[PDB]
CSV table of C-alpha atoms in Angstrom, one decimal:
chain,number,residue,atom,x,y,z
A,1,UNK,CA,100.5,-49.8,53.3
A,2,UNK,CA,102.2,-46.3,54.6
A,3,UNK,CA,105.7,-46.8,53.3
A,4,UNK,CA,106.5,-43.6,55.5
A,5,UNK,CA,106.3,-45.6,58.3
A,6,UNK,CA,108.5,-48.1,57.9
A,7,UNK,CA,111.3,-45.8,56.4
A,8,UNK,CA,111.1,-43.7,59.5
A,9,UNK,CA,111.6,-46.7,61.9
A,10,UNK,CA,114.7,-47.2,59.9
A,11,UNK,CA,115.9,-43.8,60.2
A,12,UNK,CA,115.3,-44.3,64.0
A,13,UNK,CA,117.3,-47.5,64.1
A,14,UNK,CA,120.1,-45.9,62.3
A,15,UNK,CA,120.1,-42.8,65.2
A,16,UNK,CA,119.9,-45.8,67.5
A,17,UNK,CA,123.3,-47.1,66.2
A,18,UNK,CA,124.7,-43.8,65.5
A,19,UNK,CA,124.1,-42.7,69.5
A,20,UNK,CA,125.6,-45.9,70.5
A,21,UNK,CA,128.9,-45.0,68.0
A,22,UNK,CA,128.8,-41.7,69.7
A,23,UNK,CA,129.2,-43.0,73.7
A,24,UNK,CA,131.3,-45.4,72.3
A,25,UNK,CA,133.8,-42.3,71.2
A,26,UNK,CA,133.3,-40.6,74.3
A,27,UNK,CA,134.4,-43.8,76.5
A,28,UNK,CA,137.8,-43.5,74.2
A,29,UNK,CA,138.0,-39.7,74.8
A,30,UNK,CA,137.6,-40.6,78.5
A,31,UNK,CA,141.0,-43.8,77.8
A,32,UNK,CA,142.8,-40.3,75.6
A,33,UNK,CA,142.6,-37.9,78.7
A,34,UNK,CA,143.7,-41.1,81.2
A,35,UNK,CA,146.6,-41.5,79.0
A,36,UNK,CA,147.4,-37.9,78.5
A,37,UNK,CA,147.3,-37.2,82.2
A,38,UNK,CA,149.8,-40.7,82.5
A,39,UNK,CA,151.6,-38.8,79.5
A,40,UNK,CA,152.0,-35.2,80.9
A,41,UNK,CA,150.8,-34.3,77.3
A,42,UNK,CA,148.5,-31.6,76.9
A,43,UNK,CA,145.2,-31.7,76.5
A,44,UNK,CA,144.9,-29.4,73.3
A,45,UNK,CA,146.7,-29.5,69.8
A,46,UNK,CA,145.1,-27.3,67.3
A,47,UNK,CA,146.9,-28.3,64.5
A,48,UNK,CA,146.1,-31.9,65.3
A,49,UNK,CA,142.4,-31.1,65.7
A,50,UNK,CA,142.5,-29.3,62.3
A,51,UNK,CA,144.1,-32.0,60.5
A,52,UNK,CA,141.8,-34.6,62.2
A,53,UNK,CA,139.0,-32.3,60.0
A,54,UNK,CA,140.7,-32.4,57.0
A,55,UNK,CA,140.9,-36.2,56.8
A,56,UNK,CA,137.2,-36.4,58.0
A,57,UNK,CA,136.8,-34.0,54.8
A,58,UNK,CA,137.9,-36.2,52.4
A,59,UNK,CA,137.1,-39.5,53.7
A,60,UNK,CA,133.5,-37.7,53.7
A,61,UNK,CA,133.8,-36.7,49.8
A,62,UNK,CA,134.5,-40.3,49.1
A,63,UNK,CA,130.6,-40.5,50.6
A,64,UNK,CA,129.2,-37.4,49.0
A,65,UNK,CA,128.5,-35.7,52.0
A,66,UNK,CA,129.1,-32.0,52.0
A,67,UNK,CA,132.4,-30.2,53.3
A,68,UNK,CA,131.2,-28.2,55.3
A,69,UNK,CA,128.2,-30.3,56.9
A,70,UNK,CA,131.1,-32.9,57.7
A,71,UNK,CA,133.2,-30.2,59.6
A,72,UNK,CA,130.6,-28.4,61.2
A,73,UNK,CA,129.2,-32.3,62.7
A,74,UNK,CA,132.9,-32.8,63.3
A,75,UNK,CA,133.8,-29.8,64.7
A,76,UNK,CA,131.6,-30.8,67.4
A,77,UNK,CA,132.4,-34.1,68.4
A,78,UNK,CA,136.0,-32.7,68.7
A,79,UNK,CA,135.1,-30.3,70.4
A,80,UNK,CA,133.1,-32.7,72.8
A,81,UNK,CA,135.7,-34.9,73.8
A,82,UNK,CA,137.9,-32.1,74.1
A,83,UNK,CA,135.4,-31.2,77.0
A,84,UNK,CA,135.7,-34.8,78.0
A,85,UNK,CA,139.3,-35.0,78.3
A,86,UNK,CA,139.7,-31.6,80.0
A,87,UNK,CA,136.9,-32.6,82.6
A,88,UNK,CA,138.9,-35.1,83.6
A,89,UNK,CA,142.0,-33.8,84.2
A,90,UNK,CA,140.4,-30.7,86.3
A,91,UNK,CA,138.9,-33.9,88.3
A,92,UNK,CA,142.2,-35.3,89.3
A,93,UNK,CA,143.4,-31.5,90.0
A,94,UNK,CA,140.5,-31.0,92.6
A,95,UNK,CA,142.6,-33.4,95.0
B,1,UNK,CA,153.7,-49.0,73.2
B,2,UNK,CA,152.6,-45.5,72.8
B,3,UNK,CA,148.7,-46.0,74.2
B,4,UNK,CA,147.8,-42.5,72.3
B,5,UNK,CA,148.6,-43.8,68.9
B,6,UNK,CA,145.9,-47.3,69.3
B,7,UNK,CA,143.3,-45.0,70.9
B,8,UNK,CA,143.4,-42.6,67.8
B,9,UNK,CA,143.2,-45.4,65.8
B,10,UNK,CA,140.2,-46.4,67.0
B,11,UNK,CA,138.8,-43.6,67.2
B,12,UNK,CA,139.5,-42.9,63.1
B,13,UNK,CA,137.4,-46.4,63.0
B,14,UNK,CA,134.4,-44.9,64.5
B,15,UNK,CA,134.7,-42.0,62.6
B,16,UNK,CA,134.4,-44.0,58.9
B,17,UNK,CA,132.0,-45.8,60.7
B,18,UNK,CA,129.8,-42.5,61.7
B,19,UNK,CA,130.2,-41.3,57.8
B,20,UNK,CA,129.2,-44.7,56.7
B,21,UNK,CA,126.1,-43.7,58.9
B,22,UNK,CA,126.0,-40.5,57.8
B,23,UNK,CA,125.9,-41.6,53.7
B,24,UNK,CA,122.8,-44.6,54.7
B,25,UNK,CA,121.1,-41.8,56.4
B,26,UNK,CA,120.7,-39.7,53.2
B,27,UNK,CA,119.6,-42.3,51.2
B,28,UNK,CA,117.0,-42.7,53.2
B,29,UNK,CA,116.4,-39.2,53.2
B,30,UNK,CA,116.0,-39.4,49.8
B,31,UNK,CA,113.5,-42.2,49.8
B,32,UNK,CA,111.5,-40.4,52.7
B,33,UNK,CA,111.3,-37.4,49.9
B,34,UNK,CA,109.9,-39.6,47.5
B,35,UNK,CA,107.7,-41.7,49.8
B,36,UNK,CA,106.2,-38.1,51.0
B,37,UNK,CA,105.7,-36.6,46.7
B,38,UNK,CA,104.0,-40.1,46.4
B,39,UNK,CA,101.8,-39.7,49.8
B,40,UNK,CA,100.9,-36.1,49.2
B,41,UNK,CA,102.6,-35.1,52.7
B,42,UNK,CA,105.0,-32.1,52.7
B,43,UNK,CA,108.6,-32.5,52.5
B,44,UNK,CA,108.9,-30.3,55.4
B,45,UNK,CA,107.1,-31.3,58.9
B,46,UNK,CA,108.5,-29.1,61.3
B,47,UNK,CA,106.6,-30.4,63.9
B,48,UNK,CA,108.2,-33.9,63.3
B,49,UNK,CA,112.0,-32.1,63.3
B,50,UNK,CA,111.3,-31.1,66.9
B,51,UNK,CA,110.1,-34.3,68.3
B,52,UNK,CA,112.2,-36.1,66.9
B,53,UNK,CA,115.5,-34.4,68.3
B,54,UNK,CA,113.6,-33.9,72.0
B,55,UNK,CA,113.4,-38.2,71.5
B,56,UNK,CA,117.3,-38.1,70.6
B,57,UNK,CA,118.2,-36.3,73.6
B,58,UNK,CA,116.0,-38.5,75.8
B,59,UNK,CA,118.0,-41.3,74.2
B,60,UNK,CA,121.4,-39.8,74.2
B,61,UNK,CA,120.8,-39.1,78.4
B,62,UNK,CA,120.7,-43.3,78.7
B,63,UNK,CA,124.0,-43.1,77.4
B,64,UNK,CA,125.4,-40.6,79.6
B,65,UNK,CA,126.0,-38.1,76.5
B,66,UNK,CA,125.7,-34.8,77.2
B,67,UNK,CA,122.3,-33.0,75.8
B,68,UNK,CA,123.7,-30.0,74.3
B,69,UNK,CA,126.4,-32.0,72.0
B,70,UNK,CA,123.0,-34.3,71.3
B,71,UNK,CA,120.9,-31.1,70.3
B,72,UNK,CA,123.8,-29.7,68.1
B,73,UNK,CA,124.7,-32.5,66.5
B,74,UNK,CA,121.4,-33.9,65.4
B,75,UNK,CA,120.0,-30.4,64.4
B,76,UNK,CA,122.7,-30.7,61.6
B,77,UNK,CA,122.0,-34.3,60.3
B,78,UNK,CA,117.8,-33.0,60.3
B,79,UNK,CA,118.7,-30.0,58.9
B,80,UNK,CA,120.9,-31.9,55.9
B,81,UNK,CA,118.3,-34.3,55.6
B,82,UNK,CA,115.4,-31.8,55.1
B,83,UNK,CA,117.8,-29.8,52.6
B,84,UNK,CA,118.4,-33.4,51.1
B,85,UNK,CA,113.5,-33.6,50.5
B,86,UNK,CA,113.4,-29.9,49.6
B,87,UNK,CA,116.3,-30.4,47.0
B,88,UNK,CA,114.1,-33.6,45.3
B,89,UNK,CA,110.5,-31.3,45.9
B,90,UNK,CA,112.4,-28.4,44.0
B,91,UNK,CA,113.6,-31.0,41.2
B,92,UNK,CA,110.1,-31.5,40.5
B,93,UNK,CA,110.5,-28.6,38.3
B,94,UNK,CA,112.0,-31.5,35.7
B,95,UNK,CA,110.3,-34.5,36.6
């Protein structure tokens, strides 16, 4: 009985629900930029984005997971709907 | 209301939900190290690493998330969880 195998098809089905999480946050970046645009708020606030990290930080120490692993994973997904948001307002701009 | 201030909240409750994620997936990286020192496979199968994100970005694509956020993002959670097997090889030292 390969007990590699099964462990590795939960690893997959974890990815599975963690990619589903992810679209999920982009659909909300997507209702953020709508409602900024609504707003006339600007897209970017680096002070919010680095308090947003901090939180993550220690939320993430509560789970042992490592500082800086949790802001450089962060930092990304930030950073992506960021993109998001932005890509929608230039959308609305092109008219 | 203030839409903002409910989209942010939901997003903060995918985020504990990700690092929730995040913490299951290192236990299994754990027992994946284990499974492997019991199997006589290395901790480290490079080959494995690469098919394995080329599969996640497949998968991200269905959900309209972009490829390079995909690549990023799940070259750091491989990367933690193959320092995660190479930290429990190198402990062999005092088992």
């Amino acid at each position: 009985e390969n007990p590699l195998l099964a462990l590795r098809e939960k690893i997959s089905a974890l990815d599975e629900k963690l990619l589903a999480l992810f679209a999920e946050r982009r659909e909300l970046a997507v209702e953020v930029g709508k409602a900024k645009l609504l707003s006339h708020r600007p897209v970017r606030d680096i002070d919010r984005e680095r308090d947003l990290l901090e939180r993550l930080i220690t939320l993430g120490k509560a789970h042992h997971l490592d500082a800086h692993f949790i802001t450089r994973t962060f930092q990304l997904g930030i950073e992506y709907s960021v993109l998001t948001q932005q890509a929608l307002l230039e959308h609305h701009h092109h008219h």
